[PDB]
Design a protein around this ligand. Sequence first.
Ligand SMILES: CC(C)(C)OC(=O)NCC(=O)N1CCC[C@H]1COC(=O)Cc1cccc(Cl)c1
Ligand code: NA
Ligand code: NA
Lengths: 249, 9, 27
Amino acid sequence: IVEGSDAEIGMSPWQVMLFRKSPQELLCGASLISDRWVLTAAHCLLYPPWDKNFTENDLLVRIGKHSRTRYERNIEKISMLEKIYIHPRYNWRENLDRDIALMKLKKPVAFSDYIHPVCLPDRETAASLLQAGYKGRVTGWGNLKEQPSVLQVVNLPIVERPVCKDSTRIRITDNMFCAGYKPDEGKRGDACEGDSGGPFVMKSPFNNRWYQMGIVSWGEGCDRDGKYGFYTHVFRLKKWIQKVIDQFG
Amino acid sequence: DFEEIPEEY
Amino acid sequence: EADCGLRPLFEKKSLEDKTERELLESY
Ligand SMILES: CC(C)(C)OC(=O)NCC(=O)N1CCC[C@H]1COC(=O)Cc1cccc(Cl)c1
Ligand code: NA
Ligand code: NA
């Protein structure tokens, strides 16, 4: 999303957009994990330091989009939020530990070539693919540097925890990971403001399926050398995701 | 800058 | 679901997008 390429049509059919009804504006990214469940980052709905606390009726869900601002008639679908669910131990106070949230839509969305959920990892796929050096993909309509015309895409390698901890003064947890090239590694690219809540995905070489490994959570700047994007560790909060969905559903 | 989503949403 | 993670315009048609091999290659 900071360099960054235009997506391919239907390249990320699970990519959701968090849209503000008034003033009509892009809010955040999100992902479709079922016909009636969208996955996003808690901070996209609740983040007191910036006076942010959105309720269901303040937001709309837009699925199947390619253009950032256009209303893609016959292709995108806009859904209403029945209910928001933030992780109980979401730490907005200190470091966005457990930066995750679920959204039940009021009605079930219709799948299409442009609309299709991503899988959630299992312990074995996660142990399998969450490895330093393995690249994941992140997509989003956010800033192109510290505003795109279409959905942007970028593949980033996972970074060693030490390197991660050593790049920042903020306390890193087991519930996060980081991605991004080293200053060395010639290539760059990063998430930025606006991509937040968007999915970090990987394609399993085992069954050829796409799994969401991470949620775009935070960075210090965007595409700064020696800095990395930090993503919510989805497999880790899985029991919370399961629990929430097996009950309020 | 966002084109008008339908009023029915 | 049983069908998650399979794109209709790629996997389901067995078409590859332009940079997915780059991911494969790191694995
Ligand atoms: C967040 C925190 C760790 C407390 O440190 C701060 O400086 N606080 C301000 C700030 O940054 N915020 C507040 C919460 C969300 C984040 C801004 O959004 C991103 O960093 C997205 C974004 C930007 C780039 C890359 C990624 Cl992966 C995600
Ligand atoms: Na440190
Ligand atoms: Na960087």
